[PDB]
Every structure is written in structure tokens, then in C-alpha cells.
Amino acid sequence: MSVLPFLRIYAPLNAVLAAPGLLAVAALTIPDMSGRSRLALAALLAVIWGAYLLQLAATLLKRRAGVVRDRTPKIAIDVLAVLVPLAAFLLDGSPDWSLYCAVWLLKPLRDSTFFPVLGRVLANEARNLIGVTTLFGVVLFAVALAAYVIERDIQPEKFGSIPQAMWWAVVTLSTTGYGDTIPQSFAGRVLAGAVMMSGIGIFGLWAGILATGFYQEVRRGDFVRNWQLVAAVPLFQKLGPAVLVEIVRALRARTVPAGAVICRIGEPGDRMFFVVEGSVSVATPNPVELGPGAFFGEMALISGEPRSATVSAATTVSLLSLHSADFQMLCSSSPEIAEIFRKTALERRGAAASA
Amino acid sequence: MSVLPFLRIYAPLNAVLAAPGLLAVAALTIPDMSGRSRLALAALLAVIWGAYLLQLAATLLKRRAGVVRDRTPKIAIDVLAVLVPLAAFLLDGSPDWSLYCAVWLLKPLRDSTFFPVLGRVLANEARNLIGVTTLFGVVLFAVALAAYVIERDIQPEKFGSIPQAMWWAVVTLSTTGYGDTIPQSFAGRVLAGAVMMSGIGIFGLWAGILATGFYQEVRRGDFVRNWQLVAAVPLFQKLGPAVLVEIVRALRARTVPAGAVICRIGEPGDRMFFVVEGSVSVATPNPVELGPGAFFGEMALISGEPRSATVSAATTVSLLSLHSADFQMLCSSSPEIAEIFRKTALERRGAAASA
Amino acid sequence: MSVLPFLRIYAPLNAVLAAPGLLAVAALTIPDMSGRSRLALAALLAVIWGAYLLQLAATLLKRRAGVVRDRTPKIAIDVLAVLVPLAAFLLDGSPDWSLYCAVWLLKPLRDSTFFPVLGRVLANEARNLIGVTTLFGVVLFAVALAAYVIERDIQPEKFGSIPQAMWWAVVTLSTTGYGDTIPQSFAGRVLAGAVMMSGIGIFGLWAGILATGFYQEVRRGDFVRNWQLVAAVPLFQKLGPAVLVEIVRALRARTVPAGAVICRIGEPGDRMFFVVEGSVSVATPNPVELGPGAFFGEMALISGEPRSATVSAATTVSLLSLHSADFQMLCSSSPEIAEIFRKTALERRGAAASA
Amino acid sequence: MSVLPFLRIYAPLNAVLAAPGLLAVAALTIPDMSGRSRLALAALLAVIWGAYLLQLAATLLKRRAGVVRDRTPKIAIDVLAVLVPLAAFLLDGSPDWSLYCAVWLLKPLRDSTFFPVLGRVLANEARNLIGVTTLFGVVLFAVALAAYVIERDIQPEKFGSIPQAMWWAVVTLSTTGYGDTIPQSFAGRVLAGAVMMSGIGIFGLWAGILATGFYQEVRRGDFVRNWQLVAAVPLFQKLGPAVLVEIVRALRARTVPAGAVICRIGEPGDRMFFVVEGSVSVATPNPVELGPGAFFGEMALISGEPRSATVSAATTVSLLSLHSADFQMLCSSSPEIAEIFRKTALERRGAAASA
Ligand SMILES: [K+]
Ligand SMILES: [K+]
């Protein structure tokens, strides 16, 4: 709610071309199809192949900035990004070679930051997952066994064995309800009463495991990326020690591209930003274009008014952002600091229009 | 649990009439129907049309308070609120013109505050949603592919292609269980074991994304709307800086309409209010009707007793509200403040009955 | 994890007898049944009727403690607890009179504390629920309409009208998957991709609304019930103002009945209690039976050892409870207080065995 | 995200062998099977039987450390781990004796720490569960009754009685959608609209009950296990009282086995550890092998740089772990402490390479 994400966060064409590349698959998978577009898109693989392959060798030029780097991740596919189709092209003479379009699916995951964020936490909380994962199997076979006891007599064809019911079990436990084969008696139908009660409590916990410290990590993502852009602010020599932990939880940074709008005039002033790198277009008669290491919005927030400028992205700017309360927190947190933002709230009343 | 919401929060008839207006649709959609009520409700569209249209031009009189306003949102439908049926009335000569009753559905969303609250946060956290949204597709086709490997032999008619299984996949992944076409073999049925395990963990996270900072926003909704009604209280010059952030998280304001009841006598005193605008009916022999900028409940809370008055809404009052703990927090937070609420807790023992 | 709930929390037989009373229904609902037990349980209604009716008049003796009371809730059924079957007995001469066994279902909800806890919060957060409830209908008909566009041609019998699909919609949206009538084409099947994506995000929020401040209320239930039993402790004149809010969030009270065990000896000391009313059986050679207003466990927690006594419920005791960290919080929170619990941790080393 | 779990957390073979032991079952459960492997795995039960039985008597040697112990839990199966198959072997002469392979399922739960963690909290919050569990049945039969009212006429065969619909009810309420027997009329289909609305709100709460204080318990698991390994650190005489509660919430300990890697060099420094027992392989020209009671990472964190050593597990080490913010919290929390970690951040610049 307090951030302006722009400049094509899904930027790199390396990620873009996996998407059309795999829709290339399906038309090959279908009878009653003409050969015309059949191979037209076979080329498109050769394009994306050739294209990533065109990108490839420039990546293999890893002499740029070659001081200390750990590029096993960023390379682990790019190797396979071209080889796996290649040997697939020959040894799989039949059209099924395209079945090695299981390969580009990681290419989005190449530059999927937020995916290392995923795997990072599993190596802390999987302890829980295992004991639950067992417990899933505990509650599975403990209960999945229960049905073989009963309908083996009159449902051999469906419940004539154990795993036939373990099938029904997880479908019965995992919120699913397929609806192929269901009992007929009372006591077997009695059993289900605790099952949905269970599985929704189980994944009531188990799925809860993920978001639990995942949120910690992403709420931690809002700090680890953002204990940076701190000393750049010339004013933050005076902030207290615990002051930042209270603050930086909320603070997120994003980039805005040149030409875009930052805060349009007259729309309700709901947030203030800290510039640390780039430049702006503060729409005034004398444009107060502030470069790396500035801010604005106190004009609107201390007053609680609309915007005093159609501030717009003159350049590519590394932005921060902040709503009132957490700045009211700052105005509360220090008399020494609100003095200047009082002055700024008078300086930029005159300085916005003047030079 | 600590708020009295009254005065028709679903107030404006602009929102009310979208509801009956669209039930007007369905009777047209049905064979074996008489023409009698068929067109009777066609008029009702003309009513709601004419009615919003009656409202419309008065809205187009936007010279009232025409100083600085951003009414592209509040107008974006009202334009289309009447034009889309209109051209639909002619060009779609067949009865299907009513299919442009997809239009009024936004009219509730016109004055749906809490909907800008919705869209506000998506422009901070969609970063997550995308990488997850991809990851959904990652886990989709990574796994959805897996079934074409197998039952193409003996289920051409169901699993004779890729997307036929991507269909089954999301139904298999998204907690659904339709139950049209399901495998027959072991290994394909083996695969499902991790699927519900996945999809409930995925949306275990992904759906968790929404409520995560949505709650922040609505818990922030309880401040941004309520850093107002602060200086109106004549006592809040002395409150400490961080004191408010601890408090205003809990504080919610709502309005009560005239004539209604506020706290009935003898029912258990569980909360105290801060009046800031309006007037009351404090049921005493001498009614202590306190106007803008007052409070009551300390009589009951410091004692932990029932109510001392059938306090009732004499007028339309802008109310706040507060339970004990967060007022016990206040009584704890300052000796300078509990002195007066001690006095008030003796003044209103005599002043409630006296003048 | 830090509480000992005992003494039959499902105590009152008023609640107990609704359970067997309604199983009395079903045997009447079934052909091929003998009249023998058919009416045997008809009497059991007359028993529970007669029994609650036996209880009833003693309740109508509401002169006990008749000073200030609000018993419209506790009486609202007891009136109907006997009248509704009664007039049902005659006017519904056919056996269907028992269909007014919809009545006792509230009798558990008579003395269901935690049910007023339920309804309390809905009158603060239903504001959200409505705008979501609308939004549910927004997203309902916005999308439910989408299918009538398509398969009306070749599925008149299933998708020949609007509400036929609104049916499929919520089943398609609400995580359900019945599996009666499903499309056949591509684009209609394309549509579902955002639906489960939606409904799990919708109730990802909407169901999240309940637990959100419900947890606040139950976490508030742990205070509002427990700002009591505070001044009874003779030591809590010295606790700091904000000290309690940090503490009482964790503190829960429950009752234990006479004869039961409180903490068995030698089992791992994981918690300490504050007695405020009742008496105990501290299993020592000289039983240190401490009455209203005492505690124990510091012997085990400061040492981190097993229990020093099979402390057991001599009488019906109003207990509190507390784990280490929040007592380590206390030992941290004040040097003035750990002095005595140091002394107590030496006094009860000698006093436990001695007198 | 801040922990290195290693050394086979699923260590004990007592737990390992329940897994293969129960797959031994299913082949017996299947017609058209040869007797060859039929009894080959019957032996494997005798192995696991004999094996746990081999383990058994050594466990019955409970004279080791026989001072004060509560081993009713750890023994409650080991007794039955061998007896239940045994009497099953004879009295159940038919092959169905293996149906007492319901027995080993608890053997993983023998040494399933995190399972006592499970049951611990249910004896605090089941109060809620009951009133909800009733409320489930309230909302069950309140609504489950509703359908018998209607389709008894034209669906005797499906809805000719009460429990036939209670079946459909929970399937209709518990997110399931089996799809065997569904109504045909309007008003009965009207009813479902509030049902999924209900059941997802019910388990929206009820399943929420588990994770609620379960997370408290596991977030408490991160303290109760970790108020230990505190005084071992020679520096923690000076930490403030409330300082730890702020910290130890985040701190988790795990073990790493000998030979493994701890932090590889050049990978991004994202965390620092506190050693308290064991030894390491700090990869330097002069290995700075620090034993029980040490730490490292401040070299990387105060600088925000990669690792200065391929620190690797020379021995089995009891580790702690910590990311920056919570150490930045420490560097913030005390000037007296950052002095030494400044010195250490200069000492280990020279001491890492030197002796
Ligand atoms: K389902
Ligand atoms: K189904």
C-alpha cells in the first residue's frame, strides 16, 4: 500500500521467452493438425534456443567483474538451456524430442529473485515439515487402513485392498472430493466426520508452516535489502539505535523509470518518499529537482492536504516510501528531527515555487 | 468487538438499486415465460436507468465545492451508467441487449470504500504475486506435463494431449475435485500425493499474501482515519509521543444515528467511548447531555460494574470506542491522566444525577 | 500449552441432554421400523422436556439475587424450550411434530460462553464482511454471467440460463467441485484458471476476517477475565504500570476440581502457577498446603529441574498458570521482585519438607 | 532461514524401520500374487520385530541413569511393539494377523519430539475446540435438517431421511464436493449459498485455532530449548534483563555433524553463529579453530561482505545462528557490546590469517 513498483519488474527477455516458447509445445501434441504451423514453431524453439544461445556465450564471457563470484546458480541452466534440446534433437528422432521442453521452465527461475527467498527458509523449518510429513502418513495409514476393514466384502472392485483406500483417503483428507468410489454403509461413512476435521486442521497447521516465517523472511526482506540506503541519507547520524528497527520493517524501496509520474498533484497526499539516487520532475514554476538523497511529502502530511506538485520521474530513481503514522512515529520519536521537517515544511512552501 | 456501527453503512440508494436491477435480468433468460412481467421489469431498468439518470445530471453539476477534486473515479461509471444500456437498446435489437446489465455491477463499487483499500495494496505486494503466479505456472506445467507421459495409450479420449491434463491439474491442485476424468494406473495416482500437498501449501502462501498486509492496511485503516478526532479532545496536549501508536491501533470510530441507544443501563459495562461530535441522551433524572468532545464509561470500568445510564443517541454522533485494557493501558500509561479520570469518576457520580 | 483445564467444562446437564435428545429424532425418520423403540424415545423427549421443564420453574424463581440482571438471553429459549414442542404436539397430529426438535439446538448455546464472544466481534468487522459480501456477489455475477455467453447453444439442458451457472460458479469458486455439469469447450474452460485463483484469495481474505480480531478477542479474553485475580495477590502493589499488559496476555486462569493432580512429582518442571482461591495437596512429609493467594514452581524453574512435589488438587481451586520465559520476563523485569523469589526459592527448599 | 539443520534429524533406526515394515503389508492384501515374496516380507516383520525386539531388552535395562525418570511414554509401545504381533501370530491363524501392523505406526511417534509439542497445547485451547465442535454440530443439524424438508417427495432414494443429508451436509460444508447425490430444485440449491460461506468461515476459525498458539508454542520452542546455551557464553553477564526476550525469539540452535561445511567462503555473508560446544575448521592459512563458546560472522556483517573463511564442521558442534538485523539489534542495543565486536572485527582480520 505504500510503494510505487515500476520499471518492468518482469524485465529480462531471458524470462519473457520461456512463456511463448512452451506454448510452442502443445500444437505438436494434437492429431488432425496441419504441418504448416507444426514446424513454424519448431523454429521458434530454435529462435529461443538460438536467442538464449546468442545470449549464452556473452554470459560465458565471465571475465567481467571476475574477482569473487558464485555463479553456479546463474549458469546451472544456461549450460542445459541449449544442450538438452540439442541431444534431444537427434537421439529422439520422433517428434517427442519436444518433450524436453521441460527445460526452459527453470529459465524464469534463473532470475527469479524471490525463489532463493523460497528455498532459504525450508532449511530452517523443514524439521517441522518432516514430523508433520510423517504425521500426515501417520494419520494417513492409521485411518486409510480403517476402510479395508469393512467394504472388502461388497466392494472388492473398489475397496478390495489397502492402497485403493489410501487413494480415497487423501482425496477424502485433502479437501478434494473427486467422487469416483464412495462407501455405502453407516460406520464407514461415520469415519469421515473426523477426516475433514483432521485434514483441514493438519494443513491448518502444515500449510501454515510456510507463511509463518516466510512472512518473517519477506518482512525481513524489507530490512536486509534496506539497511542499505541508510547512511546515504545525510541526516541519519542522529537516529537512535532502536529507532531503525521500529521503522525499517515498514520501509520498502523500489525503482521508478524515467518519464513516469511519482505523485500527481491534487490527488490525496497519503505518503512521503525518501530519494537516495536519481532525479525527479517536481512540477512547479521553478522545478525543485532534487537529486540523490532527498525527500518530499511532509508538506502534505503535516497539513493532511493534497499534493503540492505533480512530482514525476525525470530519471530512473531508487525510491523509498513511507506513510504518515510511521512518519508521525518519527515526528513523535524525536523533537530534534521534527524541527527540521518543520523548517522544511516552511522552506518548501517558498522553495517549491521559488528557486 | 469494541464498536457500535449504525446509521445504514449500506446507505446510498445508488448502491441499493443495483441489487434489484440485476435480478431483473434472469426472468428474460428463461423459456416458457409470459410476456407480462417480462417487460414489467424491463421498465425497472428504465427506472434505475432513469433514477441514476435522474441522479446523474445533479452529479454533473460539479460546481459545488469545485476547488480541487479528483472525480475520475466517482464519474467513470455514471457516464457509462446510462450510455451502455442506451446504445445497447438499439443496436442489440434482440432481447440480448439486457446482457449489458454487466454495467451496474460497478455502481456498488462506486461508493464502495474498502475497494480502494483493496487495490491500494496490490501495487506493493504484486511483486510477490507475480513470482508466485509464475511459480504457479512453474508447478503447473512441470507437473501437468507429467500425466501426458503415461495414459496417452489407454486414455487418448481424456489424456490424449497436454492441456487436457493441465485442466485436471489445477482441478487436482486447486483443492477442487470435479470428478470427470481420473487415471487408472498406479504411478499416475502416485503423483497426486505431492499435489494437494503442494497446492494447499502454495495457496497456503499465495492466498496468505492478501491478508498479510491487507490486515496491515485495515489495521492501518484504524489509524489513518483516526489520527483525526485527536486534537478535538481538549485533553490530548499532554499525551506522550509514542503513547498514541500504542493506542490508536485499537481505536475505531463509527457513527450512530439519532434516537438509537448507545449503552443501555444495567447491561455489563464492557467499554467506554470518546464523543467528539454530536449529542447524547444520558438517561438520568437530570440528563447529562454532553456534546462534541466528551466521554463516558470510566464510571463502570474503574469499578467493573454495569452501566450507570441508558446512554442513547439523541443526535447523529461521531463516536469513538475503547475497552478497558487499552484504557487500563492509559490509566497505567500516566499518573497525570488517571488523576482527572479519578475525579471524573467522582464528579459523574454526583453530576450524573445532579445537573 | 500452559493451562490445566479440569472440572467438566461441559458441565451443565442442560447442555448435556440436547445431545441424546436429538438422536431421538432420526429413528422416527425411517421406514421399515418397529413401533417399539419408536415411541420409547418419544418419551425421552418428554423426559428432556419434563427435565428442562423440571429445571424451568426453578429458573422462573428469579427472585434469587434479584437486584440488577439482564436475563433475556438466558431465558429466551427456556420459554420456548417447552412451549414449541407442546403446541407442536397437538396441531401437528402427524408424527412430523418432532420436526420441532430444531429447538433444543440453542440449549447448548444457552450456556455457551464463547458464543457471546462470537457475536461480539461481528458488530465491529461486518463493515468489511458486507463490502466483501457484495464483492463476493460482484465477482459472482461478473463471472457467473460469463458462461451463459457460450454453452447455451450445445448445453441448453445444463447451461440454458443464468442461475444454472451461478450454481456452477460458487461450486467452481468455493473450492468445491461437485462434478455434475462441466463445460466442453476451450474458452469456457480457460475461464476457471482465475476462479480458484480468486475464491481462495477471496476467502483467503474473507475467512481471514474472522480469525483476525477474533484472536484479538480471545487474546483479549485472556485479559478481560484476568485483570481480575490481580489485587488478590498481596505482592502486586509494586508491579509497574505497563508491566501487566506485557504479562497478562499470556496468563490464563482455569479451575481444577478437588482430588485431582496439579503437578506430579518428577515429571519435567515446565510451568509455575499462582493460586488465588482454594487449597492444594503439596506432596511433602509436612504438606505445605497453601490456600488462597499463593504460587509454586520457582523451585523448579530457577533451577530448571523436575518437580519437588506431587502437588494435587485438595479442593476446587481457581488457578492461574505461567511458563518460564514470561516469569523469566518477570525475573528480568524487576530486581525488587526476584529478591523474594530467590528467598522463596530457599524458603521452600526447607519449608517444603519442614512445616 | 537462519539455521543449518544437519546430522540426520530423522536419525534413529527405530523410526526408520516402521516405514519399510508397513509396505510389507500391502502385497499380502492382493489376489493373483505368488507365495514367493508373500512370505519373504513376512520375515521382514520378523526382522523388524526381532530388531526392535533386539533393541528391546537393552531398553528394559533401565538401570542406566536410574535416578529420576518418567519412561511410561518411551516404553508404552515397546511393550506392545512385540506382543501385539505375537498373540496376533497365533490367535489369528488366517493371514489377517498382519492387520496388527497398525502397531508400528506409533514407533515413529515414539521418538517424535514435536508430537508432545502437539498434544501439549490441546489441553489449553480445546475449550475453544469444544464450543466450536458443538457449534459445528449446531450448524450441522440446524442446516442438515433443512434438506429433509424438501426432496423427500421426489428423492426418497437419496434424501429420504435425515442422516442421508447430514452426509451431504458435511460434504457440502467441508469444502469437499463428492458429487454422488445433489438436489434438483431451486430453494434447496438456494441453501448452499451460505454453506460454503459458513464452513470456510468455521474452519476459517477452527483450523485457525491450531496454528494460533501452536505457533506460540513453536515460537516458544525457540526459547524453552534456548534459554539454555546462554550462561555458557562468557559475555552474557552484562546483557540487560529484557534484552534476551527481544533476541531469543529469533535464535534457534541446531547441531551440525563432523566433516560438514558451516559457511563456505565467498558465498554471501548473510548470518553469524554462536558456537557453544564442539570445534570447527575455519579455513585459513593458520586455522583459527575455536572450540566451545565462540562465534563468527561479524567480520562479514559489519562490512556486509562475503565470507572470510570456508568455516566447516570439524566435529559435531552445537550451533546457534543469527542474521544481521537481530545482531544489528544487538549492536544497537548496547554501546558496551559493540566495542568488543568492533575489536573482534579487527582482531579476526589479523587473527584469521595469523595464529
Ligand atoms: K473440493
Ligand atoms: K466431485
PDB file of N, CA and C in Angstrom, chain B residues 120-158:
ATOM      1  N   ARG B 120      -5.257  -0.723  -3.260  1.00  0.00           N
ATOM      2  CA  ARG B 120      -4.098   0.042  -2.811  1.00  0.00           C
ATOM      3  C   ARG B 120      -2.901  -0.866  -2.580  1.00  0.00           C
ATOM      4  N   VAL B 121      -3.130  -2.023  -1.966  1.00  0.00           N
ATOM      5  CA  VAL B 121      -2.016  -2.843  -1.516  1.00  0.00           C
ATOM      6  C   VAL B 121      -1.463  -3.703  -2.641  1.00  0.00           C
ATOM      7  N   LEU B 122      -2.283  -4.019  -3.646  1.00  0.00           N
ATOM      8  CA  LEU B 122      -1.819  -4.853  -4.749  1.00  0.00           C
ATOM      9  C   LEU B 122      -0.648  -4.215  -5.478  1.00  0.00           C
ATOM     10  N   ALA B 123      -0.561  -2.890  -5.452  1.00  0.00           N
ATOM     11  CA  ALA B 123       0.570  -2.174  -6.014  1.00  0.00           C
ATOM     12  C   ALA B 123       1.725  -2.034  -5.030  1.00  0.00           C
ATOM     13  N   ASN B 124       1.833  -2.924  -4.052  1.00  0.00           N
ATOM     14  CA  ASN B 124       3.055  -3.114  -3.280  1.00  0.00           C
ATOM     15  C   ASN B 124       3.500  -4.561  -3.263  1.00  0.00           C
ATOM     16  N   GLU B 125       2.554  -5.488  -3.193  1.00  0.00           N
ATOM     17  CA  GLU B 125       2.840  -6.888  -2.940  1.00  0.00           C
ATOM     18  C   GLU B 125       2.651  -7.766  -4.169  1.00  0.00           C
ATOM     19  N   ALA B 126       2.252  -7.191  -5.304  1.00  0.00           N
ATOM     20  CA  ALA B 126       2.119  -7.983  -6.517  1.00  0.00           C
ATOM     21  C   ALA B 126       3.452  -8.519  -7.004  1.00  0.00           C
ATOM     22  N   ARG B 127       4.551  -7.865  -6.626  1.00  0.00           N
ATOM     23  CA  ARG B 127       5.884  -8.420  -6.809  1.00  0.00           C
ATOM     24  C   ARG B 127       5.927  -9.871  -6.378  1.00  0.00           C
ATOM     25  N   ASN B 128       5.506 -10.128  -5.146  1.00  0.00           N
ATOM     26  CA  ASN B 128       5.338 -11.490  -4.675  1.00  0.00           C
ATOM     27  C   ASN B 128       4.383 -12.261  -5.571  1.00  0.00           C
ATOM     28  N   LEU B 129       3.201 -11.693  -5.839  1.00  0.00           N
ATOM     29  CA  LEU B 129       2.160 -12.422  -6.559  1.00  0.00           C
ATOM     30  C   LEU B 129       2.655 -12.909  -7.906  1.00  0.00           C
ATOM     31  N   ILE B 130       3.464 -12.100  -8.582  1.00  0.00           N
ATOM     32  CA  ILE B 130       3.950 -12.473  -9.901  1.00  0.00           C
ATOM     33  C   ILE B 130       4.873 -13.675  -9.798  1.00  0.00           C
ATOM     34  N   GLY B 131       5.913 -13.566  -8.968  1.00  0.00           N
ATOM     35  CA  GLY B 131       6.850 -14.665  -8.815  1.00  0.00           C
ATOM     36  C   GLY B 131       6.172 -15.916  -8.317  1.00  0.00           C
ATOM     37  N   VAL B 132       5.097 -15.747  -7.559  1.00  0.00           N
ATOM     38  CA  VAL B 132       4.260 -16.875  -7.209  1.00  0.00           C
ATOM     39  C   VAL B 132       3.395 -17.266  -8.391  1.00  0.00           C
ATOM     40  N   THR B 133       2.847 -16.269  -9.085  1.00  0.00           N
ATOM     41  CA  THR B 133       1.973 -16.532 -10.218  1.00  0.00           C
ATOM     42  C   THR B 133       2.714 -17.306 -11.289  1.00  0.00           C
ATOM     43  N   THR B 134       3.951 -16.904 -11.557  1.00  0.00           N
ATOM     44  CA  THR B 134       4.830 -17.730 -12.364  1.00  0.00           C
ATOM     45  C   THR B 134       4.986 -19.097 -11.729  1.00  0.00           C
ATOM     46  N   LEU B 135       5.340 -19.119 -10.439  1.00  0.00           N
ATOM     47  CA  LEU B 135       5.614 -20.378  -9.759  1.00  0.00           C
ATOM     48  C   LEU B 135       4.412 -21.296  -9.816  1.00  0.00           C
ATOM     49  N   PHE B 136       3.219 -20.720  -9.745  1.00  0.00           N
ATOM     50  CA  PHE B 136       2.028 -21.498 -10.011  1.00  0.00           C
ATOM     51  C   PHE B 136       2.119 -22.155 -11.374  1.00  0.00           C
ATOM     52  N   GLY B 137       2.458 -21.377 -12.399  1.00  0.00           N
ATOM     53  CA  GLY B 137       2.615 -21.940 -13.725  1.00  0.00           C
ATOM     54  C   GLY B 137       3.816 -22.850 -13.834  1.00  0.00           C
ATOM     55  N   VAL B 138       4.881 -22.547 -13.088  1.00  0.00           N
ATOM     56  CA  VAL B 138       6.012 -23.463 -12.995  1.00  0.00           C
ATOM     57  C   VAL B 138       5.522 -24.813 -12.521  1.00  0.00           C
ATOM     58  N   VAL B 139       4.959 -24.826 -11.318  1.00  0.00           N
ATOM     59  CA  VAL B 139       4.479 -26.055 -10.724  1.00  0.00           C
ATOM     60  C   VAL B 139       3.333 -26.623 -11.543  1.00  0.00           C
ATOM     61  N   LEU B 140       2.620 -25.771 -12.280  1.00  0.00           N
ATOM     62  CA  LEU B 140       1.568 -26.263 -13.153  1.00  0.00           C
ATOM     63  C   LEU B 140       2.144 -27.170 -14.220  1.00  0.00           C
ATOM     64  N   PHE B 141       2.915 -26.602 -15.136  1.00  0.00           N
ATOM     65  CA  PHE B 141       3.292 -27.350 -16.317  1.00  0.00           C
ATOM     66  C   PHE B 141       4.386 -28.350 -16.013  1.00  0.00           C
ATOM     67  N   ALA B 142       5.206 -28.058 -15.005  1.00  0.00           N
ATOM     68  CA  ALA B 142       6.164 -29.037 -14.518  1.00  0.00           C
ATOM     69  C   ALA B 142       5.475 -30.338 -14.171  1.00  0.00           C
ATOM     70  N   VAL B 143       4.311 -30.240 -13.543  1.00  0.00           N
ATOM     71  CA  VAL B 143       3.582 -31.392 -13.064  1.00  0.00           C
ATOM     72  C   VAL B 143       2.480 -31.787 -14.031  1.00  0.00           C
ATOM     73  N   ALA B 144       1.846 -30.791 -14.648  1.00  0.00           N
ATOM     74  CA  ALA B 144       0.773 -31.063 -15.587  1.00  0.00           C
ATOM     75  C   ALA B 144       1.287 -31.865 -16.764  1.00  0.00           C
ATOM     76  N   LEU B 145       2.534 -31.632 -17.148  1.00  0.00           N
ATOM     77  CA  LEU B 145       3.158 -32.432 -18.184  1.00  0.00           C
ATOM     78  C   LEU B 145       3.236 -33.895 -17.798  1.00  0.00           C
ATOM     79  N   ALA B 146       3.386 -34.167 -16.506  1.00  0.00           N
ATOM     80  CA  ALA B 146       3.764 -35.489 -16.041  1.00  0.00           C
ATOM     81  C   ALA B 146       2.773 -36.566 -16.447  1.00  0.00           C
ATOM     82  N   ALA B 147       1.519 -36.200 -16.658  1.00  0.00           N
ATOM     83  CA  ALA B 147       0.481 -37.186 -16.909  1.00  0.00           C
ATOM     84  C   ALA B 147       0.365 -37.552 -18.372  1.00  0.00           C
ATOM     85  N   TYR B 148       0.701 -36.626 -19.271  1.00  0.00           N
ATOM     86  CA  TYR B 148       0.716 -36.952 -20.688  1.00  0.00           C
ATOM     87  C   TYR B 148       1.702 -38.062 -20.989  1.00  0.00           C
ATOM     88  N   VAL B 149       2.701 -38.228 -20.127  1.00  0.00           N
ATOM     89  CA  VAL B 149       3.705 -39.256 -20.274  1.00  0.00           C
ATOM     90  C   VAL B 149       3.096 -40.649 -20.319  1.00  0.00           C
ATOM     91  N   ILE B 150       1.907 -40.834 -19.744  1.00  0.00           N
ATOM     92  CA  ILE B 150       1.509 -42.145 -19.256  1.00  0.00           C
ATOM     93  C   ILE B 150       0.255 -42.656 -19.949  1.00  0.00           C
ATOM     94  N   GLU B 151      -0.870 -41.996 -19.710  1.00  0.00           N
ATOM     95  CA  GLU B 151      -2.166 -42.542 -20.082  1.00  0.00           C
ATOM     96  C   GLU B 151      -2.597 -42.132 -21.473  1.00  0.00           C
ATOM     97  N   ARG B 152      -1.680 -41.589 -22.267  1.00  0.00           N
ATOM     98  CA  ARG B 152      -1.973 -41.342 -23.669  1.00  0.00           C
ATOM     99  C   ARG B 152      -2.309 -42.636 -24.398  1.00  0.00           C
ATOM    100  N   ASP B 153      -1.770 -43.762 -23.932  1.00  0.00           N
ATOM    101  CA  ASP B 153      -2.026 -45.043 -24.578  1.00  0.00           C
ATOM    102  C   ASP B 153      -3.488 -45.444 -24.446  1.00  0.00           C
ATOM    103  N   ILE B 154      -3.975 -45.543 -23.208  1.00  0.00           N
ATOM    104  CA  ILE B 154      -5.281 -46.125 -22.922  1.00  0.00           C
ATOM    105  C   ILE B 154      -6.312 -45.088 -22.512  1.00  0.00           C
ATOM    106  N   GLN B 155      -5.916 -43.827 -22.355  1.00  0.00           N
ATOM    107  CA  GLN B 155      -6.855 -42.710 -22.274  1.00  0.00           C
ATOM    108  C   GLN B 155      -6.492 -41.645 -23.301  1.00  0.00           C
ATOM    109  N   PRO B 156      -6.522 -41.979 -24.598  1.00  0.00           N
ATOM    110  CA  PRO B 156      -6.483 -40.898 -25.595  1.00  0.00           C
ATOM    111  C   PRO B 156      -7.652 -39.952 -25.444  1.00  0.00           C
ATOM    112  N   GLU B 157      -8.839 -40.508 -25.221  1.00  0.00           N
ATOM    113  CA  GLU B 157     -10.074 -39.742 -25.227  1.00  0.00           C
ATOM    114  C   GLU B 157     -10.132 -38.724 -24.100  1.00  0.00           C
ATOM    115  N   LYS B 158      -9.323 -38.897 -23.058  1.00  0.00           N
ATOM    116  CA  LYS B 158      -9.279 -37.999 -21.915  1.00  0.00           C
ATOM    117  C   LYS B 158      -7.919 -37.354 -21.750  1.00  0.00           C
TER     118      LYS B 158
END
